[PDB]
Design an enzyme around this catalytic site. Structure first.
Site, PDB file in Angstrom:
ATOM      1  N   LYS A   1       4.381  -1.296  -6.817  1.00 39.26           N
ATOM      2  CA  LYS A   1       4.536  -1.102  -8.237  1.00 39.26           C
ATOM      3  C   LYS A   1       4.902   0.276  -8.723  1.00 39.26           C
ATOM      4  O   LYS A   1       5.968   0.690  -8.381  1.00 39.26           O
ATOM      5  CB  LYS A   1       3.324  -1.602  -8.987  1.00 39.26           C
ATOM      6  CG  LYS A   1       2.537  -2.713  -8.344  1.00 39.26           C
ATOM      7  CD  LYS A   1       3.084  -4.083  -8.528  1.00 39.26           C
ATOM      8  CE  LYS A   1       2.423  -4.958  -7.494  1.00 39.26           C
ATOM      9  NZ  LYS A   1       1.375  -5.791  -7.959  1.00 39.26           N
TER      10      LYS A   1
ATOM     11  N   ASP B   1      -9.179   0.038  -5.699  1.00 35.42           N
ATOM     12  CA  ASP B   1      -7.766  -0.322  -5.875  1.00 35.42           C
ATOM     13  C   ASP B   1      -7.256   0.400  -7.099  1.00 35.42           C
ATOM     14  O   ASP B   1      -7.499  -0.025  -8.227  1.00 35.42           O
ATOM     15  CB  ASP B   1      -7.619  -1.863  -6.061  1.00 35.42           C
ATOM     16  CG  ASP B   1      -6.140  -2.362  -6.184  1.00 35.42           C
ATOM     17  OD1 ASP B   1      -5.181  -1.595  -6.501  1.00 35.42           O
ATOM     18  OD2 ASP B   1      -5.948  -3.591  -5.993  1.00 35.42           O
TER      19      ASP B   1
ATOM     20  N   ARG C   1       4.744   0.833  15.101  1.00 34.02           N
ATOM     21  CA  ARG C   1       3.606   0.063  14.532  1.00 34.02           C
ATOM     22  C   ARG C   1       2.287   0.868  14.462  1.00 34.02           C
ATOM     23  O   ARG C   1       1.369   0.467  13.728  1.00 34.02           O
ATOM     24  CB  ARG C   1       3.398  -1.270  15.288  1.00 34.02           C
ATOM     25  CG  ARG C   1       2.392  -2.254  14.651  1.00 34.02           C
ATOM     26  CD  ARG C   1       2.627  -3.709  15.073  1.00 34.02           C
ATOM     27  NE  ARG C   1       3.219  -3.776  16.411  1.00 34.02           N
ATOM     28  CZ  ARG C   1       2.571  -3.512  17.553  1.00 34.02           C
ATOM     29  NH1 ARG C   1       1.282  -3.172  17.552  1.00 34.02           N
ATOM     30  NH2 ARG C   1       3.224  -3.581  18.706  1.00 34.02           N
TER      31      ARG C   1
ATOM     32  N   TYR D   1      -7.228  -9.130  -8.717  1.00 36.63           N
ATOM     33  CA  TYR D   1      -5.874  -9.583  -8.466  1.00 36.63           C
ATOM     34  C   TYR D   1      -5.990 -10.848  -7.675  1.00 36.63           C
ATOM     35  O   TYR D   1      -6.722 -10.889  -6.681  1.00 36.63           O
ATOM     36  CB  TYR D   1      -5.107  -8.528  -7.672  1.00 36.63           C
ATOM     37  CG  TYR D   1      -3.711  -8.901  -7.275  1.00 36.63           C
ATOM     38  CD1 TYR D   1      -2.694  -9.010  -8.208  1.00 36.63           C
ATOM     39  CD2 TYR D   1      -3.398  -9.100  -5.944  1.00 36.63           C
ATOM     40  CE1 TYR D   1      -1.395  -9.332  -7.822  1.00 36.63           C
ATOM     41  CE2 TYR D   1      -2.119  -9.422  -5.544  1.00 36.63           C
ATOM     42  CZ  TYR D   1      -1.113  -9.538  -6.475  1.00 36.63           C
ATOM     43  OH  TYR D   1       0.155  -9.877  -6.006  1.00 36.63           O
TER      44      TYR D   1
END
Lengths: 392, 392, 392, 396
Positions: free
Chosen positions: A205, A180, A55, A108
């Protein structure tokens, strides 16, 4: 410095450091052990190296990271369980209540949600500006203003911001710029080289490029990424990327150049086609002369992208039918897969709402979005052709 | 009602419904398509069963969720990319500034960090209260108090909580009781059945059982989980679990019962062994009669568990000597792997500190913590035997 | 000497060696590189431990193979794509035209096929013999006899062979003995300790334990194995095991002992219940006192196994009815999955044939076969019970 | 009109699959399961008897594999496909079903090492008669046909010199006398060459190479008529090799094929520039690349392959020892044997695969002293140029 695809394929890995494995093995393993305890001690301090728990760090993940940092030209990288994992981990760390954040006019949807119903509800001040209006951005700056966050290009119309113009204003007031860069990828646009401080991707994506994984990447300075690693990720989101999935992403990154090249050529023919069709009122594609920020586009992006937005004369009913007729294209929100996708926000993402609400939140009745894939161009032309007729 | 083992293996799946596949196929896909826009419109309001994104629904994800729901005996479940992913995704959705959260007196480090340094820095009030003291608890119940959260058994000394008694009080005030049941797992303790509202796990530990995935689970009411899914997960964490890791987690669960039985049977031999040893001063094994809470623990847990904590004479110097001399046990943080792990925080996690500090967090100077694996006991016995000899 | 479970988990791997990773990383790589051409010269003679191509050597596969050697108490282990892979790779290496092979009276269908319709057709001679009958074995040996191959216990009646007797007879003519040890696993039986030269496994069954991979194992003497690697595998079958699948297999092997205990216990009970029922002519399960070769069984197997076969008085129609009433048991060929399985060869695998042909082959009209899974015993009982009612 | 064939890239990505038949999943779910179950005991009797469509066991059939198979088929222009655990898997499974003792197999002059070994030390030893012939010489091939000749097998281009065969010319000879033509098509992929469309009966790949493209799985493929592919399925693979592909790896191979056009277009562009460059460098005595006129079979290469490939071979001045030096100066090319990866690779069989041997011994297995072979990968061409430029300088 080697060329992008040499680095997208080699950077960060020498086969010799792992028995000559051409492909680096996958560390599918939650914990790592220690030879002694003083040695364990000196990995919650940071003079020894080796990572302690999956993690925080992991070699598979660390390579994905170093590799992406090189593609963006930045100093460090962080991998996370999704785009939103990257966006939320980022801002949770950089903002506290009383800070203002300055946001592009359109985001978004889940970004908009995280802002107005997430961190926005914990005493953090939000404000939307048009990041293309350098006059208006300056005006809107304050000294509470800690962060400027936009997407360029942005949903829905592909509205772009002058990134370097914005960094200048940030440099002056002392605010942090987060871009972004999902749509473009490092292969097309590289905000850190235009003075942004951080970039965030939904690696889900274009980077993965094969619609089989969900993932995200932060890239920026060691100093900031380390903060995001150790606070936003460790403590505040736990958006951890699977070593399996990270290796898949690394695999799709090897063909990024080749896939993006084809995404952009397909898109261009398709754009030029669309502009000549009776059923189409408006098109938004960065590679057309008609694009209102055409000059900015060429200055900042090396190619116009795979994404097309366009608007149908007969409104929402004409888009319902355009969308239902598509045989090769699929109906799905999401983008940047080899398979060509399309969505009609008016009657998919944003359905119940009646028209003023749609406009108010900046969404035309007939607006369709396409993610143009790696299929054969005559095939796509033909599916779109026939779907346009069905739109009537 | 089918048995626990039956259900761990079959619940929620029929081979006849998927081409006859005995093991469910793995839905390693980031997005789903729609047959129509109208079908997809329905998918965002809510009224069409199936799926929208891998960040909300996915059949591989759903199976695990259902199945984990059934073991804990809850209405509905949710899987995420880690323990932290669950804890944060839950807390984020249930708290807003000016709310309070009451907490056990000691928490998993990163849970602690998140609370004090993460969400507790956006105006959420925190208080630590010993959750075995109903008097002390009912006392702290102001009317702000929105959530009561804790671990039972809890680090370091396996301190238990009167779950039924805490629930009674919370139901009385309108609070939500949230339990991290990572350590027992539903095979050994079902807190919802004691009026817990929500349980969370690090599936990184026992549920996977094999130290090869990071993952987390939430179980509880439909209403509470629909909320945590659609806000915490969807917008505030982005902690999406890989469907590959979800499959490997399901694989793990198919032997939770066999694994836990051996974990517990080995843990108890070693614990009894330890109790007869001159180098050990005091032990925290729920299963020994001399455990301060032997009786509340059996009310709530079918078995004493796989973790042992104990204190060495010779304090800190003894620890190191012990820790370093093991050759079967591994030095690591983490627990609930097939592999037996040991850690001694004075000289590992909290090494940078000094004894005067180690008092503050209730961490003794000779406290070593065994997570007892699945290896043949005689080996684990001999290994621990010579590591105590070496602690002179 | 570390106990079985300790070895099944740890043998062949120290975390230190590989940067602390508790679970070794998975070498999903097809090729391996070299630092110089000199070091490249070495890997086409072979006096070094390394690799040249995953199809001959890969660390993940080697680890698996070391771990299978240790458990079967053999010198050397080989991993392959399926049990058939292992069986054919083994036999193709050790037999040439004019060579004879003595076989167990009955064999797994595809092994029978391989022999009679594959290799047998390239001028290898075949003879079937009962392997409990040492006088008939000794009497069937010819100078052409090179290999003795059998399963033990063997379908369909769980017929045993006297492994150590055979190996003695084999010693006289210098012949090689090969044992399909699939059914028992090295946890229940170790043929190499009883003088066999080689064992093969379909890891697809108990070793995987969870029905998600296909995989084969050979174990035996270094020189024999080396030749099966270098000839059978490399040149003659090319049944190369995916590193991924080998990793999942080793994941399985970690709970082999525990799963095997539960399998055997569920079975023991079901056999008691079955033997006493009105509808049941006959029963073949090793653990019953009435089982023909009970005494030999117990010399070789530490436990009676998880497989049962029985014959329903009413023949084909009873079986046919009994199979369709099952709700918890799945109708399918195969075995050793966590899910319990069943098949009635008469109306399934061998349904095309007519009655006198299935007797000609050794198949009763009501013979049913159960792979007793890991589910709750009471649930399995209930399923069987009602399917027994319904068979009338 | 709707009876147009979708383009190659459209099919490499979409063929045989519709998301709506599987929940909307854009990517097919991976059937990582070793066995399949029957609704009644009757339905089970059908799939061992041939009557109702369905699955019994992943070692015989599996939907993930099936889709891969139907997809590779479409791409080769064959009727059916089969997916196996390795290249050698595909080949051995094929020949073990097509051949018995007394049958004769005609082989091309050079072969892949393990294929050569399979035939000479494996199936050749079990009563099958072998004869090597220059497949480029149709007179000599007609000349070698017997009534015992059952199978003609060959690669094209051929390991290691990329010697080419007249595929059409062969299938015509083979039609006349009645034999089965198997072509190993690994080096071209169906994107550049399709032997089934030129008259061959079966093609076989090492999918481990270009089809995967990312060198992380091992895999084979057979494509041909439905009957021969069925036979091989149910005899070669089911009984005789057990060379079953992991559905996980098969899912990865389909991921590879979604970019195959692109990658091949880049391997080939890269290789053509490198070859041209290499021909002009002083130390390079000669060079063999299909896309230069100096290629002996330059016209047949063009005839049959839509692009000249990604493999280059050449000879340095300086014998073996100049190679040693060249190869050890490579900083970006890796020292490896294989091809079809995105990483560029270089082998010097003189000082590597054939290093044991002594100079003379090379000439009578056929291999020059300063022979370097190259799988040109996907890196930026200008880095690959510089790597070879500076390595030559060290090989001086």
């Amino acid at each position: 410095l080697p060329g992008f695809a040499t680095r997208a394929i080699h950077h960060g890995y020498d086969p010799q450091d792992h028995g000559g494995a051409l492909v680096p093995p996958v560390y599918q393993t939650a914990t790592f052990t220690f030879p002694t305890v003083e040695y364990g001690a000196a990995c919650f301090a940071g003079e020894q190296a080796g990572h302690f728990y999956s993690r925080i760090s992991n070699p598979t993940l660390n390579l994905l990271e170093a590799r992406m940092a090189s593609l963006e030209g930045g100093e460090a990288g962080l991998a996370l369980a999704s785009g939103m994992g990257a966006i939320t981990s980022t801002l949770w760390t950089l903002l506290r209540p009383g800070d203002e954040v300055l946001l592009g006019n359109t985001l978004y949807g889940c970004t908009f949600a995280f802002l107005h119903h997430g961190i926005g509800e914990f005493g953090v001040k939000l404000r939307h500006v048009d990041m293309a209006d350098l006059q208006a951005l300056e005006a809107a700056m304050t000294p509470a203003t800690r962060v400027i966050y936009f997407e360029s290009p942005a949903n829905p119309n592909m509205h772009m911001a002058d990134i370097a113009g914005v960094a200048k204003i940030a440099r002056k007031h002392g605010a942090t710029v987060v871009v972004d860069n999902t749509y473009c990828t490092p292969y097309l646009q590289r905000p850190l080289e235009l003075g942004a401080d951080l970039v965030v991707h939904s690696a889900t994506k274009y980077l993965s490029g094969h619609g089989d994984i969900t993932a995200g990447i932060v890239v920026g300075s060691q100093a900031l990424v380390d903060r995001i690693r150790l606070q936003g990720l460790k403590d505040m989101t736990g958006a951890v990327l699977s070593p399996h999935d990270a290796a898949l992403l690394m695999r799709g990154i090897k063909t990024l150049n080749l896939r993006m090249d084809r995404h952009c050529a397909n898109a261009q023919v398709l754009a030029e086609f669309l502009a000549r069709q009776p059923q189409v009122e408006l098109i938004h594609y960065p590679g057309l002369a008609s694009f209102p920020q055409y000059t900015l586009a060429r200055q900042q992006m090396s190619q116009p992208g795979g994404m097309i937005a366009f608007e149908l004369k007969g409104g929402i009913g004409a888009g319902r039918r355009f969308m239902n007729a598509l045989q090769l294209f699929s109906r799905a929100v999401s983008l940047g897969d080899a398979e060509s996708l399309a969505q009609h926000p008016a009657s998919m993402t944003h359905s119940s709402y009646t028209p003023e609400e749609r406009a108010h939140y900046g969404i035309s009745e007939g607006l369709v979005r396409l993610s143009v894939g790696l299929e054969d161009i005559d095939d796509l032309l033909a599916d779109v052709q026939q779907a346009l007729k069905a739109s009537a």
